[PDB]
Amino acid sequence: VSNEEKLNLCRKYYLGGFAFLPFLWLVNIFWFFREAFLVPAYTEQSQIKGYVWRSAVGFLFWVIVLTSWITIFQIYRPRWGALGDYLSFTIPLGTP
Amino acid sequence: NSVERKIYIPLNKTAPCVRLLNATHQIGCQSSISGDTGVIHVVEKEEDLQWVLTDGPNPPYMVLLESKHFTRDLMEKLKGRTSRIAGLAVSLTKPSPASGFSPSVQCPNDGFGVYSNSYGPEFAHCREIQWNSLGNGLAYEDFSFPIFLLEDENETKVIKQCYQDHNLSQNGSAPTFPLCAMQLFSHMHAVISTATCMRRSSIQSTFSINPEIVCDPLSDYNVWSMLKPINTTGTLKPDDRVVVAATRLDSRSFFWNVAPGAESAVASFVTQLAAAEALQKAPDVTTLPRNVMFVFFQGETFDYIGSSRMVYDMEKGKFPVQLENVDSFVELGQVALRTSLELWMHTDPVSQKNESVRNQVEDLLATLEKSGAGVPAVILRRPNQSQPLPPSSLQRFLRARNISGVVLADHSGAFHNKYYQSIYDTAENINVSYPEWLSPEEDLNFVTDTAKALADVATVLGRALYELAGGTNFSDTVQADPQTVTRLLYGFLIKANNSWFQSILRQDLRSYLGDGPLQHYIAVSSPTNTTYVVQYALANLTGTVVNLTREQCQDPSKVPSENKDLYEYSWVQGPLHSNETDRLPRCVRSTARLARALSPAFELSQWSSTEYSTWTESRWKDIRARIFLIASKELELITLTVGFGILIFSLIVTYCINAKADVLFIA
Amino acid sequence: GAAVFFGCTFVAFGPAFALFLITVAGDPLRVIILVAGAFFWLVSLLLASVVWFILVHVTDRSDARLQYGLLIFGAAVSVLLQEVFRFAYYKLLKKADEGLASLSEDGRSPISIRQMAYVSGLSFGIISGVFSVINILADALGPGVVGIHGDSPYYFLTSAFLTAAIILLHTFWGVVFFDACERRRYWALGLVVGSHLLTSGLTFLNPWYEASLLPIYAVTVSMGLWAFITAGGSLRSIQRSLL
Amino acid sequence: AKHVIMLFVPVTLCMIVVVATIKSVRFYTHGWLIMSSLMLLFLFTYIYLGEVLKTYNVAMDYPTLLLTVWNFGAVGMVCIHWKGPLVLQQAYLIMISALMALVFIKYLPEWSAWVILGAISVYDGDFIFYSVLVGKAAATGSGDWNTTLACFVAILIGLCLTLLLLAVFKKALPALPISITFGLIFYFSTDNLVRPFMDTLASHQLYI
C-alpha cells in the first residue's frame, strides 16, 4: 500500500477520533508504530511521523479524564443521594 | 457429581433471619454474596465466648447456641465484635424458657396508634403501662451476619458430632488444622430503607429491560362478612347501623416464616369464628333492626396494615359500609389465658371527655355485662385505674371518628403471654395437648379445656353482639359449641391437613394445607394459607348449601333466585364417601368476601410516610446452608508451590530437550 | 479456594501444556494429528461405554459385588479398546503418510514417523487427562475439602498427580507402540498393553495412597527410560551433548 | 497445512468466549447489512455488557457504558465496512458471532435446537451454528465438562474432513454437515452414555 493511500488513511482515521472515539486513536498509535518510527525509508513520513505525535497526547488525554470520572463516581456513589442513582446503569444489590 | 457428596452436607430444616425495611431504618440480617464461612464453635456456657471473642486462633468463627442463651446481652457482645463472628446458628429448646422470651419491642405499634403529643399526651409512648413487659427489642435490630434457626434435633446432633470429631482443642493447645466449618447463604437484595429500595426498584422496573426488583410490600387480604347480606355494589344508607366485631389474623417472630402465633393470633379469631357461627343460628336473624359485620384484619403486627387500609377505603368511599354507619366496635384481643376466669374490658379514656360518647360506652359495657351474666365461667371486669387502650385495631378507627368501642382481653396490665411474637408461642403455650393413644382423626374431634374456655368466651361475645343489634328476644339460643372450637384449634395449631379443612375448600386450593400447623406471617404472596382457610371456614360456619350444578355455581345469573350482588358462591369439595375417592362437592351460599389489605402509603406512593406503615421485605435467591471441612493455609501454600514448581520444571525441561533435539536423537 | 485450583491445575496440565506450547504449537501440521488422535480416543471410550451400558442394564443392578466385577471388566475392555484404536490410528498415519507425503510432495518428509508417534501419544494423553481431572478441578474452587465422611483430605492433589502420570504414560506409550509396530517386535506390543493394564489396575487400590501411587511413577520412570532409549538416545548421547 | 490452522483459531476462540459466558453469567439458562449490524453492534453489546456486570455486581454508570458501546460498535462498524487492520478485522468477526450465538440459546426452547440445526444441515456465517451447537452442550445436564469438550473435538474433525474432501472434490462443499453429524451424535453419545461410565469410575476414583 502506497504512501498516498496511507496518508488518506491516517488523516481521516485521526479525524474520526473527534467523535468521542479514543479506541480509534488507541489502535492508531498501536498500528502505525513500526511503520512510522522504525524504518527511515520515506520522504512522505513527516505527515505520518507527526500524526502519531498528535494522536499520542490525544488518547492519553482521555485516560486521565475517564479514570478521573470512574474513581470520583465509585468513591462518591453512596455519599451522593439519588443523584448518584439515576445515572447508575447497573446497581449492586446488597451494598448501598 | 459424586465428589461434592464427599465434601458437603446440606441442612434441610432451617429458618433464616430475613431483612425487612422501614422508612427510616432497616431490620434483620444479611450475609455477603456467596455465603459466610466459619469454623463451628458450640456454646454451652457464657464462659465459652472467651474462645470466640478473645482466644480464637481461627478468627471468623460461627457460634452454635441453644436458644435459651439467645439473650439480649449476648447479642450486644456479638454485635459489638463483628470482625471475629460471621454467622450464628440457633437450636430450638424443648423445655421452653420459663423466664419468657419476646423479641418484639417493649411497646408495639407505638407511633401508629391514636395517642400522640396532640391527642393523648400522658398516655403517649405507653408511659402508664408497658404492654409487652418482657420484650427485649431484639427483632428490630439490624445485624451484619446470618442467624439461622435449626428446627430439627438430628441436624443439631450431626453438627455437634462433627464439632466433637474435629474442632476440639486438647491439653491447652491448638486444634488440628483439618477443621469443620459451616456456610450460611442469605444475601438480601435490599438496602438502607424502603424509600431507597422502592425508588431503586422503580427505576429498574421502568427505565430498563429485565426489571431487577429488590423489595416487596407486605400485602394480603382482609376477610370479612356480614350477618345480613348487603349490596356490595354501592354503599349503605346514612341511617343504617352496623356493629363491627374485629380481630387480628397474623403474627411473626425473630425468624422468617416461623410465625406460630397461638396466643396472640389463633385463639382470638377462633373464638370469633365460633361467635359467628353461634350468632348465625339465631331463630330471628333476618329481622334485626341493625346489622353485624365480622372482620379479620391482617397485617396488624406491621403497624396496622389492614386496619389502616380498611379505614382509608372506608373514608374514600370505596367500601360498602361507610364510617357513618358504625354504631359500636367490639375488638377481641388476647383471650386465651384468663388467669382467674376474668375478662377485662378496655375502653379509651381520652375520647370519653365527650359526654355523649361516654354514655354510649357506658351503655355498651352495661350490655356486655348483661349478656355475660348468663355465663358462669366468664367474669367481666373493667380496669379500675383509668388507663389507656391496648394495641389493637380500634386504634385506627379512633384516628377518624370516635366510635363507641371496647377491646376485650384477658389482661389488665401487661400481657400474660410470655412469648408474644416468639417462636415459642405454640399450642403448648395455651395448654392445647391431646392424649397419645388416639388416632389423628379423633384428635380432630377431641375436646380440650382450652376449647371449652374459648367456647364460653364466644358465648359471651355472641350474646353481646345479639343484644347490640337489638335482638332482645332469643338470647339463650345463641351459644357456641366446643366441637367447632376444637376442630379449628386442631386445624390451625396442630395439623392443617385435616379431614375437615379439606371438605370446605375448593379443589384448586388443597396445596395450601400442608402437614404441620399453619404459620401466620403476612407474606408478600398476596393470598396466604391462613387467609383462604379463614375465608372458607367462615363460609361454612355462616353459609348454607344449595342445589346447583357446578356450571350454575360458577355463575348464578340464570337462576331467578340466588342473587350475585348480595351473596357470594363457591364450589367446594365434599366429604369423602367411604371405600373409594368420592368427594361430594356442593355450593355454599355465604358472604365470606375478601378486601384488599395493602397500606395507603403504597397506594399514594409516598414511600417516606409517618402514618401508614411503610414495611417492605427484601427479595433474595437460594437460601441454603451446608457444612464441610476446611484445610490449613499451609496446605494451600504448599499445593500452589507444587503447582508452580511442576509448571516451571516442565517448561525448563521441555525447552532444554527441544533445543538439543539434534544431538540427543540419531535416526 | 482458587489457590488449590491453580495449584492442582498446574500439577495436572503442567507437562501437557508444556509439550503442547513448546513442541506442537509451532508446527501447524501436528495440530491435525493431535485432534485426530483425540478423536479416535473418544471413539474408543464411546465403544467401551456402550458395552458397559449393555452389561449394567442386562444384569439388572441387584448385587453390588457383581456390579463391581462388571466395573473391573468394563475398565479392562476400555483399556483393550484404547490399545486397539492406537493401532488403528497407526495404520491411518501410515496410509496418510504415502498418500500426502512423497506422492503429493517433493522432499518425502514434512514430518517423520517418530514425531507422529510423539504427537499421537500426546493427543491420547491430553484427552484422557482432560476427562480424568476437569470434573475434580471444578470442585477445587469450593471453600471446602474432601473428608467429612471419613475420606482423605489429599484427594485433589493425588488426583492431579495421577492425571499427570497418565498423560506422560500415554505420550511414552505411543512412541514405543509405533516403534514396536514397525520392527514387528510383537512382544513389546504386548508389554505396552500389559503396562497399560497394570497402570489402570493399580488405581483399584486407590484410597491406599501410599503404595498405589509410588508404583505408578515407578512404571512411569521405567517407561520413560525405555522410550528414551527406544527413540535413539543413550548415556553416551547425553554425556556428549553439553557443548 | 497453514490454512487449516487459520480455520481453527477462529472457531476455537469463538467457543472459549461462548463457554466462559455460559458457565459464568448464568442468565442464558448499504442496505440490510447496515441496519442488521447497528442493532447487533450497539444493541447486543448493550445487553451483553449489561448482563456481564450484573453477575459480578459492580456499578458502571451511563457516562461510561454509553461511551464504551460507542467505542465498540462504531469502531466495529468502521473496521468492516471501511479499511482496517486484518487482525482487528479478524477479531471482530469472532465477537459478532458469539453475540449472535448467545441470543439463540436463551430464546429457543428446550430441545427444538436439536431440530433447527438438523433441518438446516439436511437442506444444505458458519461460526454462529457451531457456537450455538456447543453452548447447548455447555449448559444442559449437570455440570459435566465431558460433553462440552467431546463436542469441541467432534467439530474440528468435521472441519478437517471437509478440507480433506475439498482437496479431492474441488468445486464446492457445504462444510457444515460433517461437523454436525459428528457433533449431533457425540452429544447424545456421551451425555447419557459415557457420563454414567465416567461417574462410576469417578466414584471409586479410578483411571483408564
Ligand SMILES: *[C@@H]1O[C@H](CO)[C@@H](O[C@@H]2O[C@H](CO)[C@@H](O[C@@H]3O[C@H](CO[C@@H]4O[C@H](CO)[C@@H](O)[C@H](O)[C@@H]4O)[C@@H](O)[C@H](O[C@@H]4O[C@H](CO)[C@@H](O)[C@H](O)[C@@H]4O)[C@@H]3O)[C@H](O)[C@H]2NC(C)=O)[C@H](O)[C@H]1NC(C)=O
Ligand atoms: C422504622 O422502624 C424502626 C425500628 O424500630 C424504628 O426505629 C425506632 O424508632 C424509635 C422512635 O421513637 C426509637 O425509639 C427511641 O430511641 C431513642 C434512642 O435511645 C437509644 O437506645 C438505647 C437503648 O437502650 C438507650 O439506652 C440510649 O439512651 C440511646 O440513646 C430513645 O432515646 C427514645 O426514648 C425517648 O426518651 C425520651 C426521654 O425524654 C422521651 O421523651 C421519648 O418519648 C422517648 O421515649 C426512644 O426509645 C427506637 O430506638 C428505634 N429503634 C431502633 C432499633 O433504633 C423507626 O422509628 C421506624 N420508622 C418510622 C416509624 O418512621
Ligand SMILES: *[C@@H]1O[C@H](CO)[C@@H](O[C@@H]2O[C@H](CO)[C@@H](O)[C@H](O)[C@H]2NC(C)=O)[C@H](O)[C@H]1NC(C)=O
Ligand atoms: C438433607 O437432605 C439431603 C438430601 O437432599 C441429605 O443428603 C443425603 O444424605 C444421605 C445420608 O447421609 C446420603 O446417602 C445421600 O447421598 C445424600 N444425598 C445427597 C447428598 O444428595 C442430607 O443428609 C440431609 N441433611 C442432613 C443433615 O441429614
Ligand SMILES: *[C@@H]1O[C@H](CO)[C@@H](O[C@@H]2O[C@H](CO)[C@@H](O)[C@H](O)[C@H]2NC(C)=O)[C@H](O)[C@H]1NC(C)=O
Ligand atoms: C374525638 O374525641 C376527642 C375528645 O373530645 C376530640 O379531641 C378534642 O378535640 C377538640 C377539637 O378538635 C380539641 O379541643 C382537642 O383536640 C380535644 N379536646 C380536649 C382534649 O379536651 C377529638 O377531636 C375527636 N375527634 C377525633 C377525630 O379524634
Ligand SMILES: *[C@@H]1O[C@H](CO)[C@@H](O[C@@H]2O[C@H](CO)[C@@H](O)[C@H](O)[C@H]2NC(C)=O)[C@H](O)[C@H]1NC(C)=O
Ligand atoms: C401454603 O401454601 C403453599 C402453596 O399452596 C404451600 O407450599 C407448598 O408446600 C408443599 C410442601 O412442601 C410443596 O410440595 C409445594 O411445592 C408448595 N407449593 C408452593 C407453590 O410453594 C405451603 O406448604 C402452605 N403452607 C402450609 C403451612 O401448609
Ligand SMILES: *[C@@H]1O[C@H](CO)[C@@H](O[C@@H]2O[C@H](CO)[C@@H](O)[C@H](O)[C@H]2NC(C)=O)[C@H](O)[C@H]1NC(C)=O
Ligand atoms: C393431606 O392428606 C391426604 C390424606 O392423607 C393426602 O392425600 C393422599 O396422599 C397420598 C400420598 O401423597 C396419596 O397416595 C393418596 O392417593 C392421597 N389421597 C387419599 C388417601 O384420599 C394428601 O397428599 C395430603 N396433602 C399434603 C399436602 O400432604
Ligand SMILES: *[C@@H]1O[C@H](CO)[C@@H](O[C@@H]2O[C@H](CO)[C@@H](O)[C@H](O)[C@H]2NC(C)=O)[C@H](O)[C@H]1NC(C)=O
Ligand atoms: C361444613 O362442613 C361440615 C363437615 O362436617 C358439614 O357437615 C356435614 O354435612 C353433611 C351434609 O351437609 C351431613 O351429612 C354431615 O352429617 C355433616 N357433618 C357434621 C355435622 O359433622 C356441613 O354441611 C358444612 N356446611 C356447609 C354450609 O357447607
Ligand SMILES: CC(C)CCC[C@@H](C)[C@H]1CC[C@H]2[C@@H]3CC=C4C[C@@H](O)CC[C@]4(C)[C@H]3CC[C@]12C
Ligand atoms: C512396564 C515396564 C516395567 C517393563 C520393563 C521391561 C524391561 C525390563 C525391558 C522391556 C524391553 C527391554 C529393552 C528392549 C531392547 C533393548 C535394546 C538393546 O540394544 C539393549 C537392551 C534394551 C534397551 C532392553 C532393556 C530392557 C527392557 C527395557
Ligand SMILES: CC(C)CCC[C@@H](C)[C@H]1CC[C@H]2[C@@H]3CC=C4C[C@@H](O)CC[C@]4(C)[C@H]3CC[C@]12C
Ligand atoms: C471394595 C472392596 C469391597 C473390594 C476390593 C477388591 C480389591 C482387593 C481387588 C479388586 C480389583 C483387584 C485388582 C484388579 C487387577 C489388578 C491388576 C493386576 O496386574 C495386579 C492386581 C490388581 C491390581 C488387583 C488387586 C486386587 C484388587 C484391587
Ligand SMILES: CC(C)CCC[C@@H](C)[C@H]1CC[C@H]2[C@@H]3CC=C4C[C@@H](O)CC[C@]4(C)[C@H]3CC[C@]12C
Ligand atoms: C494419619 C497418618 C498417621 C496415616 C496416613 C497418612 C497419609 C494420609 C499420608 C502419609 C504418606 C503420604 C504420601 C507421601 C507421598 C506422596 C507422594 C506425592 O507425589 C503425592 C502425595 C503422597 C502420595 C502422600 C499422600 C498422603 C499420605 C499417604
Ligand SMILES: *[C@@H]1O[C@H](CO)[C@@H](O)[C@H](O)[C@H]1NC(C)=O
Ligand atoms: C431423629 O433421629 C431419631 C433416631 O434415628 C429418629 O428416630 C427420629 O425419627 C428422627 N427425627 C427426625 C425429625 O428426623
Ligand SMILES: *[C@@H]1O[C@H](CO)[C@@H](O)[C@H](O)[C@H]1NC(C)=O
Ligand atoms: C343495589 O341493589 C339493587 C337491588 O335492589 C340493584 O339493582 C343495584 O344494582 C345494587 N347496586 C347499586 C345501587 O350500586
Ligand SMILES: *[C@@H]1O[C@H](CO)[C@@H](O)[C@H](O)[C@H]1NC(C)=O
Ligand atoms: C360528641 O360526639 C357526638 C357524636 O360523635 C357529636 O355530635 C358531638 O358534637 C361531640 N361533642 C363534642 C364536644 O365533641
Ligand SMILES: *[C@@H]1O[C@H](CO)[C@@H](O)[C@H](O)[C@H]1NC(C)=O
Ligand atoms: C390445663 O391448664 C393447666 C395450666 O394452664 C395445666 O396445668 C393442665 O395440665 C391443663 N390441662 C388439663 C386437662 O387440666
Ligand SMILES: *[C@@H]1O[C@H](CO)[C@@H](O)[C@H](O)[C@H]1NC(C)=O
Ligand atoms: C320477640 O321479641 C321481638 C322484639 O320486637 C318481637 O318482635 C317478636 O314478636 C317476639 N317474638 C314473638 C314470638 O312474639
Ligand SMILES: *[C@@H]1O[C@H](CO)[C@@H](O)[C@H](O)[C@H]1NC(C)=O
Ligand atoms: C335441586 O336442583 C336440581 C337441579 O338443579 C333440581 O332438579 C331439583 O328439583 C332441585 N330441588 C329442589 C327441592 O329445589
